[PDB]
Amino acid sequence: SHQLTIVHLEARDIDRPNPQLEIAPKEGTPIEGVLYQLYQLKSTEDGDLLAHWNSLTITELKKQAQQVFEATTNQQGKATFNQLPDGIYYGLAVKAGEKNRNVSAFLVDLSEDKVIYPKIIWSTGELDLLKVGVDGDTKKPLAGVVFELYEKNGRTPIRVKNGVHSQDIDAAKHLETDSSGHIRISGLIHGDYVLKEIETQSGYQIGQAETAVTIEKSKTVTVTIENKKVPTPKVPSR
Numbered sequence: 001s002h003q004l005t006i007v008h009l010e011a012r013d014i015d016r017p018n019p020q021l022e023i024a025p026k027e028g029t030p031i032e033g034v035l036y037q038l039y040q041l042k043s044t045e046d047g048d049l050l051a052h053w054n055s056l057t058i059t060e061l062k063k064q065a066q067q068v069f070e071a072t073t074n075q076q077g078k079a080t081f082n083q084l085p086d087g088i089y090y091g092l093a094v095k096a097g098e099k100n101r102n103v104s105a106f107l108v109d110l111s112e113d114k115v116i117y118p119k120i121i122w123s124t125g126e127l128d129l130l131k132v133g134v135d136g137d138t139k140k141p142l143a144g145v146v147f148e149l150y151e152k153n154g155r156t157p158i159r160v161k162n163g164v165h166s167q168d169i170d171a172a173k174h175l176e177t178d179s180s181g182h183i184r185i186s187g188l189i190h191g192d193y194v195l196k197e198i199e200t201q202s203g204y205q206i207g208q209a210e211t212a213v214t215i216e217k218s219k220t221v222t223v224t225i226e227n228k229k230v231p232t233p234k235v236p237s238r
Contacts (some may be wrong), residue, residue, distance in 0.1 A: 003083070004080075007116070008026075008030065009028025012027065014026075021119075022116060029075075030075070034072065035070065036073070039089060039090045091116070092105035099165045100135075103181070104198060120168040123218065125218055127149075127185045131181045131183070133229070134227065134229065143179045150207070192213075193212075197211075204227040211225055220237060
């Protein structure tokens with residue numbers, strides 16, 4: 001049996017050049033309350049072992065594992081795993097019943113006590129969506145159009161409060177273009193997202209249901225989505 005300590009630090013890119021699992025970043029802020037799970041492997045046959053484990057859904061992890069262990073990071077950002085049997089473990093952070101994509105999952109070759117620093121992304125940027133309505137060659141901002149936002153391939157909508165991504169219980173999934181045609185959302189961790197158009201104004205069609213957006217840290221990504229007017233052909237004669 002061995003000790004494993006997962007240290008969850010939000011560090012700057014400059015605090016962690018050439019990140020390596022067992023090398024501490026130069027600086028970093030501990031985060032409390034992060035749920036880590038460690039899945040004890042039953043088999044090591046796959047030559048692409050990390051990719052294999054990364055491909056599994058959360059419930060599949062359990063199915064393929066021998067024992068499963070959990071720990072929550074403490075006041076020093078440490079999720080402690082005591083007396084783990086000698087073995088290979090796949091570790092990930094979990095949030096809202098799924099893998100937290102902002103923590104890179106890892107394999108631990110637990111042949112001795114280990115201290116590991118998962119690669120963690122946290123820096124945010126902003127989305128600025130302009131929604132327009134199109135009538136021939138003229139485009140104008142459209143108010144009251146409803147969108148939801150998802151992480152790429154995500155099942156559950158990102159909620160927003162105070163124009164910011166929020167985890168508060170009153171943060172809403174419904175996003176509505178303002179009188180100027182805009183939805184602005186800051187505090188999105190950098191990465192890939194999907195805007196889903198839910199409902200548009202009367203007289204218009206939803207043209208692109210889902211629109212890919214990439215948030216870049218410390219930047220605003222500007223996106224324009226068009227809504228075309230409903231076509232009104234006459235009923236053709238035989």
